Amino acid sequence: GAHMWEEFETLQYSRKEGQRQENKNKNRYKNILPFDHTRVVLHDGDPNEPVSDYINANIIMPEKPKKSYIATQGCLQNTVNDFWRMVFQENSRVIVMTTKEVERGKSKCVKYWPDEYALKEYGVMRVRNVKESAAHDYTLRELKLSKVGQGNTERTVWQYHFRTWPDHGVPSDPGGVLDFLEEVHHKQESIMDAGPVVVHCSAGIGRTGTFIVIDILIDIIREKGVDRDIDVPKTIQMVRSQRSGMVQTEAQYRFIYMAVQHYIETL
Numbered sequence: 001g002a003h004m005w006e007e008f009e010t011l012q013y014s015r016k017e018g019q020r021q022e023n024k025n026k027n028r029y030k031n032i033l034p035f036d037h038t039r040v041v042l043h044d045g046d047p048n049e050p051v052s053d054y055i056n057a058n059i060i061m062p063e064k065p066k067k068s069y070i071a072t073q074g075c076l077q078n079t080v081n082d083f084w085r086m087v088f089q090e091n092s093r094v095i096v097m098t099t100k101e102v103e104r105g106k107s108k109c110v111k112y113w114p115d116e117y118a119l120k121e122y123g124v125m126r127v128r129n130v131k132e133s134a135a136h137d138y139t140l141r142e143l144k145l146s147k148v149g150q151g152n153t154e155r156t157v158w159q160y161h162f163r164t165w166p167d168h169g170v171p172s173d174p175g176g177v178l179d180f181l182e183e184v185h186h187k188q189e190s191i192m193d194a195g196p197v198v199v200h201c202s203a204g205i206g207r208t209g210t211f212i213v214i215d216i217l218i219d220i221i222r223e224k225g226v227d228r229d230i231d232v233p234k235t236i237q238m239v240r241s242q243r244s245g246m247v248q249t250e251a252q253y254r255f256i257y258m259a260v261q262h263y264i265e266t267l
Helices: 021-026 077-089 175-189 207-224 232-240 250-266
Strands: 039-041 054-060 069-073 094-097 119-122 125-134 138-147 155-162 197-201
Touching: 021 054, 021 077, 039 054, 054 077, 069 077, 069 207, 077 119, 077 125, 077 138, 094 175, 138 175, 155 175, 175 207, 175 250, 197 207, 207 232, 207 250, 232 250
Parallel strands: 069 197, 094 155, 094 197
Antiparallel strands: 054 069, 119 125, 125 138, 138 155
8 A cells, every 4th residue: 555654753783985085076966875785886996096096986786587786976076977887887778867967056066978970988998879858747868888899788777857847846746756766667677687777866875765665666576576575665774775865855765655555546
């Protein structure tokens, strides 16, 4: 059942790598840092770099196809290259961007994709944008990613860039997010053994957490049916044990229940 039995206020691991001096400028916000136990560790870095294994990102495992997520911050100018090393290494084929690049005059994510019909190299990674599709609530970008110089490493990465999240609050109706999530679901399932779905917003905790928790709950309903046991606080705590603070506001909390209730109504 998607009923709210408990209030948001009742919801309330080391982060050593993200606190290192060499990593300070890789964080958008000084005290929003990844837990060491779940962080994405980047291998095959430039051997001239003393620290090349860090990005502010955690794998989120729900605890049926086994689907996982990478929850991360919007790219900074100096972390675009590392963001593409992460997507490549993890075999991610779907990216979910939940913000504009700039909202109310503050940067939330540096543009990390090329324009439509262009290619750019971001460090050792080559990214080609072969087609955009602009739908009411989102734009889908079909990106081809390969390692520079390297034969047959190309794979398609589908970036779903949600466009209709308000600058204040949350959407007043979840229909846009549910249609977007259903297309992400079908895309991910269409690609054999795809890696984690990457999800980001400015800090990688509030909108990112709201999206990931809704998706996890809907996937439970896929497996178990509309009358299954749902426990939204328990799920939020389970995601919070893997990245600090996921789901930031009471409106986001209410929006989770509304989204799942609406999904159930659809069936």
